[PDB]
Design an enzyme around this catalytic site. Structure first.
Site, PDB file in Angstrom:
ATOM      1  N   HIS A  45       0.788  -1.225   0.000  1.00 37.12           N
ATOM      2  CA  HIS A  45       0.000   0.000   0.000  1.00 37.12           C
ATOM      3  C   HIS A  45       0.825   1.281   0.000  1.00 37.12           C
ATOM      4  CE1 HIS A  45       0.404  -0.092   4.494  1.00 37.12           C
ATOM      5  NE2 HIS A  45       0.322   1.220   4.353  1.00 37.12           N
ATOM      6  N   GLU A  59      20.104   6.572   6.788  1.00 34.88           N
ATOM      7  CA  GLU A  59      19.448   7.785   7.269  1.00 34.88           C
ATOM      8  C   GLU A  59      19.168   7.782   8.778  1.00 34.88           C
ATOM      9  OE1 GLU A  59      19.178  10.776   7.016  1.00 34.88           O
ATOM     10  OE2 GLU A  59      17.668  11.201   5.489  1.00 34.88           O
ATOM     11  N   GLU A  69      24.190   9.094   4.677  1.00 34.47           N
ATOM     12  CA  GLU A  69      23.159   8.755   3.700  1.00 34.47           C
ATOM     13  C   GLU A  69      23.618   8.386   2.296  1.00 34.47           C
ATOM     14  OE1 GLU A  69      23.703  11.531   5.300  1.00 34.47           O
ATOM     15  OE2 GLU A  69      21.884  12.459   6.095  1.00 34.47           O
ATOM     16  N   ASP A  93      -0.153  -7.551   1.862  1.00 36.48           N
ATOM     17  CA  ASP A  93       0.375  -6.195   1.841  1.00 36.48           C
ATOM     18  C   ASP A  93       1.900  -6.229   1.865  1.00 36.48           C
ATOM     19  OD1 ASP A  93       0.574  -3.470   1.867  1.00 36.48           O
ATOM     20  OD2 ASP A  93      -0.253  -3.188   3.891  1.00 36.48           O
ATOM     21  N   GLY A 186       3.138   6.408   8.441  1.00 40.87           N
ATOM     22  CA  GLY A 186       4.493   6.831   8.139  1.00 40.87           C
ATOM     23  C   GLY A 186       5.489   5.754   8.525  1.00 40.87           C
ATOM     24  N   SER A 188       4.469   2.571   8.003  1.00 40.85           N
ATOM     25  CA  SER A 188       4.058   1.540   7.051  1.00 40.85           C
ATOM     26  C   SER A 188       5.222   1.074   6.185  1.00 40.85           C
ATOM     27  CB  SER A 188       2.935   2.066   6.144  1.00 40.85           C
ATOM     28  OG  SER A 188       1.802   2.471   6.893  1.00 40.85           O
TER      29      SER A 188
HETATM   30 CA   LIG Z   1      19.811  12.931   7.155  1.00 42.89          CA
END
Ligand SMILES: [Ca+2]
Length: 240
Positions: A45, A59, A69, A93, A186, A188
Site C-alpha cells: 500500500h 538515514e 546517507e 500487503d 508513516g 508503514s
Molecule cells: Ca539525514
C-alpha cells in the site's frame, strides 16, 4: 512510532526511508527493509500510487545531513499479485523494489535478516518497531529515527473477539496493544525486528492500525508476516 524513543544513530542499518517526489522536493511516506544491495522490501500500500519514488539508506535525521546517507532511485516495483487495495484486512500487503543501483554496504548500511519460511513466534516475543512515522495519533512525523519495544501477541489471542477478531489473518503478525506504544502512519512498510537465537531478524512489515487511532488498548499494530512470503520473495529476486 507512538511512545518510542530516539534510536542510537545507525543502530538499525537495514531500515530505509521511502520517499516520493512532490513538485520539486521529496517527502518521507513509508519505511522499508534493505534485503539486497539492490532490493528493498516494503508494504504494497506504500507503492499503490503512481508517483516517483526514491530510497534513502543510512538515514537518521530526515531534516539534516548526517554524513551517512545514500540516495537511490527505484526502477521496478513488484507488488504481490493478490494485493487488493480495497481490502487490506485480506493481507498480501507486501512489495519488492528493485533499486536503480546497488547501495554500498558499510557501517551504516547493512542487509536485513529474514526468518526461515513458516517461522511463527511465541506469544509475547521480544521485538522492536522502528520508523519515522507519526509520534501521536494525527500528530506529525518524527525527524529522527524512533524505536519502541513491541512484544508479539500470538494469532490465537489477536484473532479473538477481545482484540482484532476476523480482521486479522494467520498471514499476519500482531505486536503491542498496551495502549501506550505502537506504529503509526508513516511507519508503514517498515520492519519489526525480533530477537531469535541471539540475532534480530525482520519478521514483519508494518501494515495497519485501528481506525480509532494508532495506540489503542487491545488493538495491536498489524504486520505482514514475512516468514509466510519467503518463497515468493526468492522467486522474485532470482528472476530479476
Ligand atoms: Ca539525514
Amino acid at each position: 512510532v507512538v511512545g518510542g524513543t530516539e534510536a542510537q544513530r545507525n543502530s538499525w542499518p537495514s531500515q530505509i526511508s521511502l520517499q516520493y517526489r512532490s513538485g520539486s522536493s521529496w517527502a518521507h511516506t513509508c519505511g522499508g527493509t534493505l534485503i539486497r544491495q539492490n532490493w528493498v522490501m516494503t508494504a504494497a500500500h506504500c507503492v499503490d500510487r503512481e508517483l516517483t519514488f526514491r530510497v534513502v539508506v543510512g538515514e537518521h535525521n530526515l531534516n539534516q545531513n548526517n554524513g551517512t546517507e545514500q540516495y537511490v532511485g527505484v526502477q521496478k516495483i513488484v507488488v504481490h499479485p493478490y494485493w487488493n487495495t480495497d481490502d487490506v484486512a485480506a493481507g498480501y500487503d507486501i512489495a519488492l523494489l528493485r533499486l536503480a543501483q546497488s547501495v554500498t554496504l558499510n557501517s551504516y548500511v547493512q542487509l536485513g535478516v529474514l526468518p526461515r519460511a513458516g517461522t511463527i513466534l511465541a506469544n509475547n516475543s521480544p521485538c522492536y518497531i522502528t520508523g519515522w512515522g507519526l509520534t501521536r495519533t494525527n500528530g506529525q512525523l518524527a525527524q529522527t529515527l524512533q524505536q519502541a519495544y513491541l512484544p508479539t501477541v500470538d494469532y490465537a489471542i489477536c484473532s479473538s473477539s477481545s482484540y482484532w477478531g476476523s480482521t486479522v489473518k494467520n498471514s499476519m503478525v500482531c505486536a503491542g496493544g498496551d495502549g501506550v506504544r505502537s506504529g503509526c502512519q508513516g511507519d508503514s512498510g517498515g520492519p519489526l525486528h525480533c530477537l531469535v537465537n541471539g540475532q534480530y531478524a525482520v519478521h514483519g512489515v508494518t501494515s495497519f492500525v485501528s481506525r480509532l487511532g494508532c495506540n489503542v488498548t487491545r488493538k495491536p499494530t498489524v504486520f505482514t508476516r514475512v516468514s509466510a512470503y519467503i518463497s515468493w520473495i526468492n522467486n522474485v529476486i532470482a528472476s530479476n
